[PDB]
Design an enzyme around this catalytic site. Structure first.
Site, PDB file in Angstrom:
ATOM      1  N   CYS B  94       0.778  -1.235   0.000  1.00  0.00           N
ATOM      2  CA  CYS B  94       0.000   0.000   0.000  1.00  0.00           C
ATOM      3  C   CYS B  94       0.815   1.294   0.000  1.00  0.00           C
ATOM      4  CB  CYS B  94      -0.925  -0.005   1.208  1.00  0.00           C
ATOM      5  SG  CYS B  94      -1.539  -1.660   1.519  1.00  0.00           S
ATOM      6  N   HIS B 346      -8.450   2.604  -3.840  1.00  0.00           N
ATOM      7  CA  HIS B 346      -7.100   2.380  -3.336  1.00  0.00           C
ATOM      8  C   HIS B 346      -6.218   1.549  -4.290  1.00  0.00           C
ATOM      9  CE1 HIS B 346      -3.675   1.491  -0.976  1.00  0.00           C
ATOM     10  NE2 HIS B 346      -4.137   0.460  -0.293  1.00  0.00           N
ATOM     11  N   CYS B 376      -1.722   2.625   6.334  1.00  0.00           N
ATOM     12  CA  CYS B 376      -1.377   1.306   6.838  1.00  0.00           C
ATOM     13  C   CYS B 376      -0.879   0.511   5.649  1.00  0.00           C
ATOM     14  CB  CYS B 376      -2.601   0.630   7.471  1.00  0.00           C
ATOM     15  SG  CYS B 376      -4.076   0.642   6.429  1.00  0.00           S
ATOM     16  N   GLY B 378      -0.210  -3.504   4.170  1.00  0.00           N
ATOM     17  CA  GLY B 378      -0.441  -4.927   4.345  1.00  0.00           C
ATOM     18  C   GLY B 378       0.762  -5.650   4.906  1.00  0.00           C
TER      19      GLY B 378
HETATM   20  C1  LIG Z   1      -3.261  -1.542   4.141  1.00  0.00           C
HETATM   21  C2  LIG Z   1      -4.204  -0.775   3.246  1.00  0.00           C
HETATM   22  O1  LIG Z   1      -4.361   0.452   3.381  1.00  0.00           O
HETATM   23  S1  LIG Z   1      -5.093  -1.655   1.988  1.00  0.00           S
HETATM   24  C3  LIG Z   1      -6.692  -2.365   2.349  1.00  0.00           C
HETATM   25  C4  LIG Z   1      -7.032  -3.408   1.338  1.00  0.00           C
HETATM   26  N1  LIG Z   1      -8.408  -3.335   0.928  1.00  0.00           N
HETATM   27  C5  LIG Z   1      -8.851  -4.102  -0.058  1.00  0.00           C
HETATM   28  O2  LIG Z   1      -8.138  -4.906  -0.668  1.00  0.00           O
HETATM   29  C6  LIG Z   1     -10.308  -3.959  -0.405  1.00  0.00           C
HETATM   30  C7  LIG Z   1     -11.045  -5.259  -0.171  1.00  0.00           C
HETATM   31  N2  LIG Z   1     -12.203  -5.410  -1.032  1.00  0.00           N
HETATM   32  C8  LIG Z   1     -12.441  -6.552  -1.694  1.00  0.00           C
HETATM   33  O3  LIG Z   1     -11.702  -7.545  -1.624  1.00  0.00           O
HETATM   34  C9  LIG Z   1     -13.720  -6.586  -2.563  1.00  0.00           C
HETATM   35  O4  LIG Z   1     -14.021  -5.255  -3.016  1.00  0.00           O
HETATM   36  C10 LIG Z   1     -14.949  -7.148  -1.719  1.00  0.00           C
HETATM   37  C11 LIG Z   1     -14.671  -8.600  -1.298  1.00  0.00           C
HETATM   38  C12 LIG Z   1     -15.168  -6.292  -0.463  1.00  0.00           C
HETATM   39  C13 LIG Z   1     -16.235  -7.104  -2.572  1.00  0.00           C
HETATM   40  O5  LIG Z   1     -16.038  -7.789  -3.807  1.00  0.00           O
HETATM   41  P1  LIG Z   1     -17.014  -8.962  -4.262  1.00  0.00           P
HETATM   42  O6  LIG Z   1     -16.730 -10.139  -3.404  1.00  0.00           O
HETATM   43  O7  LIG Z   1     -16.837  -9.158  -5.726  1.00  0.00           O
HETATM   44  O8  LIG Z   1     -18.530  -8.516  -4.039  1.00  0.00           O
HETATM   45  P2  LIG Z   1     -19.128  -7.218  -4.755  1.00  0.00           P
HETATM   46  O9  LIG Z   1     -18.058  -6.569  -5.567  1.00  0.00           O
HETATM   47  O10 LIG Z   1     -20.332  -7.651  -5.513  1.00  0.00           O
HETATM   48  O11 LIG Z   1     -19.557  -6.174  -3.637  1.00  0.00           O
HETATM   49  C14 LIG Z   1     -19.994  -4.875  -3.987  1.00  0.00           C
HETATM   50  C15 LIG Z   1     -21.474  -4.751  -3.739  1.00  0.00           C
HETATM   51  O12 LIG Z   1     -21.675  -3.728  -2.731  1.00  0.00           O
HETATM   52  C16 LIG Z   1     -22.401  -2.639  -3.267  1.00  0.00           C
HETATM   53  N3  LIG Z   1     -21.796  -1.395  -2.773  1.00  0.00           N
HETATM   54  C17 LIG Z   1     -20.457  -1.114  -2.572  1.00  0.00           C
HETATM   55  N4  LIG Z   1     -20.229   0.096  -2.120  1.00  0.00           N
HETATM   56  C18 LIG Z   1     -21.494   0.655  -2.017  1.00  0.00           C
HETATM   57  C19 LIG Z   1     -21.959   1.931  -1.592  1.00  0.00           C
HETATM   58  N5  LIG Z   1     -21.149   2.907  -1.185  1.00  0.00           N
HETATM   59  N6  LIG Z   1     -23.317   2.173  -1.607  1.00  0.00           N
HETATM   60  C20 LIG Z   1     -24.155   1.189  -2.020  1.00  0.00           C
HETATM   61  N7  LIG Z   1     -23.832  -0.051  -2.441  1.00  0.00           N
HETATM   62  C21 LIG Z   1     -22.475  -0.257  -2.412  1.00  0.00           C
HETATM   63  C22 LIG Z   1     -22.295  -2.764  -4.788  1.00  0.00           C
HETATM   64  O13 LIG Z   1     -23.407  -2.168  -5.431  1.00  0.00           O
HETATM   65  C23 LIG Z   1     -22.245  -4.276  -4.963  1.00  0.00           C
HETATM   66  O14 LIG Z   1     -23.551  -4.845  -4.997  1.00  0.00           O
HETATM   67  P3  LIG Z   1     -24.141  -5.434  -6.365  1.00  0.00           P
HETATM   68  O15 LIG Z   1     -23.406  -6.690  -6.656  1.00  0.00           O
HETATM   69  O16 LIG Z   1     -25.590  -5.688  -6.148  1.00  0.00           O
HETATM   70  O17 LIG Z   1     -23.922  -4.412  -7.427  1.00  0.00           O
HETATM   71 HG   LIG Z   2      -3.552  -3.953   0.616  1.00  0.00          HG
END
Ligand SMILES: CC(=O)SCCNC(=O)CCNC(=O)[C@H](O)C(C)(C)COP(=O)(O)OP(=O)(O)OC[C@H]1O[C@@H](n2cnc3c(N)ncnc32)[C@H](O)[C@@H]1OP(=O)(O)O
Ligand SMILES: [Hg+2]
Ligand SMILES: CC(=O)SCCNC(=O)CCNC(=O)[C@H](O)C(C)(C)COP(=O)(O)OP(=O)(O)OC[C@H]1O[C@@H](n2cnc3c(N)ncnc32)[C@H](O)[C@@H]1OP(=O)(O)O
Ligand SMILES: CCCCCCCCOCCOCCOCCOCCOCCO
Ligand SMILES: [Hg+2]
Lengths: 239, 390, 390
Positions: B94, B346, B376, B378
């Site tokens: 990150c 991100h 932060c 990972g």
């Molecule tokens: C150390 C650091 O700083 S880094 C942190 C690391 N963070 C990450 O890697 C992010 C993690 N996120 C992920 O892995 C993925 O985005 C997940 C698992 C959360 C979701 O992905 P998926 O498993 O494919 O499920 P999906 O993409 O369908 O989830 C999104 C759903 O939420 C809904 N949604 C998301 N945000 C919003 C919002 N703000 N308002 C309304 N609905 C929302 C979408 O409409 C969607 O629903 P839909 O399928 O009916 O259209």
């Molecule tokens: Hg990450």
């Protein structure tokens, strides 16, 4: 020979190296029934008493290495009162621990299937050399129980919590390839070279090339994980 | 005054953030996205000669395919930057981009170059975050395998600090809300570099706004979402997690002396830098150890800082960090004023420099003197930078 | 004397170099190979507390699979190095490891850490050099696609400097010859960290020598080889090219002040660092522009340098560089005295710090005062470092 039983034999080899072979005469496989456990006790004490021993190789004379005891004995054993059952296991475990505490290098030559107690015997050794065609695993969960001969103690300290949990909670058989990747085993060779590989490895342990004491140490102490990493690992595992 | 070897940020530029899932950048490579950005930023600063660029330090995480083999050099070669300049790609997950800035900074301070181009990129649409990931079995002997799943680390940090589902959803609503406001009011006009992309129909056109933002995000819409990492009891959802985005960030950095000579007013100056480690399981907490080390090096106290940019990995990790940093009650006054990763996305490689860039513009627009960008990382790390507008 | 913030190399350690094609490391992961090495080197220097390591900067090129997601942190976590320390992975292709050293050095000079662990790794057996490579079509608009094929760049640099097939094979014979000599005479005893591996039969044992060396290499055996990159007219062969190897290198670096306090004698001190770019097509020429910049920063002349370590990517690029560096006639007196990449292999990520490590030991063994390690970098770059034994 150093020890001659009906399930186990301890034959002296070159350079003070000794071979403890499993071969349950009259039966098709090796297994930790009452007889074998008792003979292991004797074989261990015999080796423990022979000051000329410089190393031990644990092998099998059957097509398998060592599998579980007859389901029949499981049923009987589990009818005993908790105190007796636990006392009986304390005694069995004392044998494996004594084999683990031998002040000499030990190596398990896995030629074939090594399940449950069989694997637990292997985990008690310092090194494990496995034939690429063999399989190992702890199927205890299939019977509603879990490793009872140090399995839950040794496997986690050898291959890590996540991997030990995966093996124990699934009870799946693991191929040579996978066993090497998680370090449940230290080397994988063809069936024809198993003996030579075990003999070669033991000599390197004896010469000091391989630090058998350091390799053993991890299963005699606490896990390396943090209180924090532990919580993450155990809570997610449970979940 | 400013010492000759002090590090000055001449300018900041970033691409419009696009949705990796069928978004605007779906047909644009990571290298091209990076080159175009670098090219445009250098074009707005005609007084800085591309030939003077000693090194192009680019942040990128999943370095394979479009992003492999030192994408920093691959992008540079398609720019007005001469072949005589060098280039390296940095990875600190990150924080890759922020590390990129730190390395250039440190190079400028020691007299190993005067002008640098830093930034980063991540095209998660073309190189997904879990692409080519091969867990090391032996790792389970020292840490928990689950520590490698960011979502679960958020869950743990959250439970540990008691961050409720409501608190997380609120932060998310605020993020989209503030990002949309900043967009509409042209607060992102200076940093966003217009760029070619495609719409849902494949029509070619220019984008000058972040697609990621969802203004219709309310507590109600977020409450309907289900836990994303813990089915039974989880509080973290897709709506309160940073988005899977495609984006690049860029900065021109040079010694104060060179900035004086060229007669160009600094966007800001670096006062301190710092990285730090924490347990992998609670990686989201990385910012506090890093921020403390950086504040000490800057000779400042958290109170002296006027504006803060904390990457929004998960509301579950952002809120605890703000509390422990002792600025939660100051949130609406100086934290992520133009929205955060929950609304802006991100893109790993790009984020470090991105939030730093947005910070500088937030400071400029609101008369800030000292700013702090931190995030932060990972697998248990945190990184931070202290900037001063003088 | 040594200023408090000068950069000191406390120690150097490397793994035995293994053949990627069925070699000793065939069953060892890049992370584990890196951790084991770091662990052992820290073990030989008991006075340096692992908890003091500010950052673990590791060089690695193909960062996917075993080598992806910041392998530097993945390796650190399985070491006695605490979770409180940080870690980043650096990529500058062939020079990744040297850049790692430069970044830590610059960190030390500016007061952003006192103790660092640098090094690098590349397990080409598990992550082949062409694995996951996705050429960018748009690149052909600015440079030649063929510039991405190292072999062809060697062919071009060679034809341009008239390096004959005989001259190239000679260099290669010398490389194996000198590497074998150094091995036999225990000149690699101090730097090679014994390590577990497997022989052709899968038997487990310890290796304390480099498998890559081929003592039976003669002009006759090399003359039988066919061109590897240009069927009609080519002069470069597999015998005069660096080998596909698996290996890791490592260094403990710290401020002179800290070294003074801990009372430990420096293996060497850094006097200057430098990177530079050249056209991708003749990447092998990178060392001369870089070496010139580094020598100027060190306030020295090529003549003041007692020993040289030039990475042997291809005899075809090494010879021209030596001539233009004006030390070809000094070759057997101060260049790659213990052999080079042709015999020792070139594991991208590991090489930078590796040749630098071998240089220091060459200097210590032969009473040298100033040393130069430099190498060419794919896609047109060069990197260099000047060391002083004082
Ligand atoms: C150390 C650091 O700083 S880094 C942190 C690391 N963070 C990450 O890697 C992010 C993690 N996120 C992920 O892995 C993925 O985005 C997940 C698992 C959360 C979701 O992905 P998926 O498993 O494919 O499920 P999906 O993409 O369908 O989830 C999104 C759903 O939420 C809904 N949604 C998301 N945000 C919003 C919002 N703000 N308002 C309304 N609905 C929302 C979408 O409409 C969607 O629903 P839909 O399928 O009916 O259209
Ligand atoms: Hg990450
Ligand atoms: C910029 C920088 O710093 S570095 C540049 C990066 N380096 C490179 O790209 C070159 C790396 N080398 C390679 O990729 C490969 O070795 C290639 C492409 C040159 C050749 O690969 P291949 O076509 O597979 O041929 P291969 O590697 O099998 O070897 C050819 C034969 O020459 C033999 N050979 C190789 N080196 C020698 C030698 N020094 N002495 C004697 N025989 C040799 C091999 O043993 C083999 O014979 P065999 O098959 O009977 O065992
Ligand atoms: C994975 C470990 C499996 C252990 C399960 C035990 C069932 C196998 O039977 C073998 C018997 O040896 C085990 C020790 O028995 C415990 C109780 O011992 C007392 C027996 O009582 C009989 C007295 O005559
Ligand atoms: Hg290369």
């Amino acid at each position: 020979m150093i020890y001659e039983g009906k399930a186990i034999t301890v034959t002296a080899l070159e350079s003070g190296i000794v071979e403890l072979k499993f071969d349950l005469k009259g039966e098709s496989v090796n297994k930790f029934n009452r007889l074998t456990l008792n003979e292991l006790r004797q074989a261990v004490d015999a080796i423990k008493a022979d000051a000329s021993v410089k190393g031990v190789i644990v092998s099998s004379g059957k097509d398998v290495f060592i599998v579980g005891a007859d389901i029949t004995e499981f049923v009987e054993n589990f009818k005993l009162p908790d105190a007796e059952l636990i006392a009986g296991n304390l005694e069995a475990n004392k044998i494996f621990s004594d084999f683990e505490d031998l002040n000499v290098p030990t190596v398990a030559a896995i030629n074939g299937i090594a399940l449950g107690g069989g694997l637990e015997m292997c985990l008690a050794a310092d090194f494990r050399v496995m034939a690429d065609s063999a399989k190992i695993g702890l199927p205890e969960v299939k019977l509603g129980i879990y490793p009872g001969f140090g399995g839950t103690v040794r496997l986690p300290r050898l291959i890590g919590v996540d991997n030990a949990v995966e093996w124990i909670a699934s009870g799946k058989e693991n191929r040579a390839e996978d066993a090497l990747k998680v370090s449940a085993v230290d080397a994988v060779v063809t069936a024809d070279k198993l003996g030579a590989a075990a003999l070669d490895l033991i000599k390197r342990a004896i010469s000091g090339e391989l630090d058998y004491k350091a390799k053993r140490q991890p299963k005699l102490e606490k896990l390396k994980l943090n209180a924090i990493e532990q919580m993450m690992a155990f809570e997610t595992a449970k979940g | 005054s400013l010492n000759p070897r002090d590090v000055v940020i001449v300018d900041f530029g970033r691409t419009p953030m696009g949705r990796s899932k069928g978004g605007m950048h779906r047909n644009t490579r990571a290298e091209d996205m990076s080159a175009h950005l670098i090219s445009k930023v250098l074009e707005r600063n005609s007084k800085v000669d591309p030939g003077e660029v000693e090194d192009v330090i680019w942040g990128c995480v999943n370095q394979t395919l479009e992003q492999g083999w030192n994408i920093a050099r691959m992008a540079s070669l398609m720019t007005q930057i001469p072949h005589t300049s060098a280039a390296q790609t940095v990875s600190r997950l990150c924080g890759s981009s922020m590390s990129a800035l730190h390395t250039a900074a440190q190079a400028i301070m020691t007299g190993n170059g005067d002008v640098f181009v830093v930034g980063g990129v991540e095209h998660m649409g073309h190189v997904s975050m879990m692409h080519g990931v091969d867990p090391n079995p032996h790792m389970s002997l020292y840490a928990a395998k689950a520590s490698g799943m960011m979502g679960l680390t958020a869950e743990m940090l959250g439970k540990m600090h008691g961050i409720s589902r409501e608190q997380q959803d609120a932060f998310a609503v605020r993020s989209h809300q503030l990002a949309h406001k900043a967009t509409v009011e042209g607060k992102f006009k200076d940093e966003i570099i217009p760029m070619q992309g495609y719409d849902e129909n494949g029509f070619l056109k220019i984008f000058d706004y972040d697609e990621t933002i969802r203004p219709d995000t309310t507590l109600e819409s977020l409450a309907a979402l289900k836990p994303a990492f813990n089915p039974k009891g989880g509080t973290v959802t897709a709506g309160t997690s940073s988005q899977i985005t495609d984006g690049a960030s860029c900065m021109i950095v040079m010694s104060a002396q060179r900035a004086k000579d060229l007669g160009l007013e600094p966007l800001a100056v670096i006062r301190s830098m710092a990285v730090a480690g924490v347990d992998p399981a609670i990686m989201g907490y990385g910012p506090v150890p890093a921020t403390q080390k950086a504040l000490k090096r800057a000779g400042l106290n958290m109170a002296d800082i006027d504006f803060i940019e904390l990457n929004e990995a998960f509301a579950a990790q952002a809120l605890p960090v703000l509390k422990d940093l002792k600025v939660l009650d100051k949130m609406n006054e100086k934290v992520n004023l133009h929205g955060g990763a929950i609304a802006l996305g991100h893109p790993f490689g790009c984020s470090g420099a991105r939030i730093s860039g947005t910070l500088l513009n937030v400071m400029k627009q609101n008369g800030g003197t000292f700013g702090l960008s931190t995030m932060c990382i990972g697998l248990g790390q945190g990184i931070a930078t202290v900037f001063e507008r003088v």
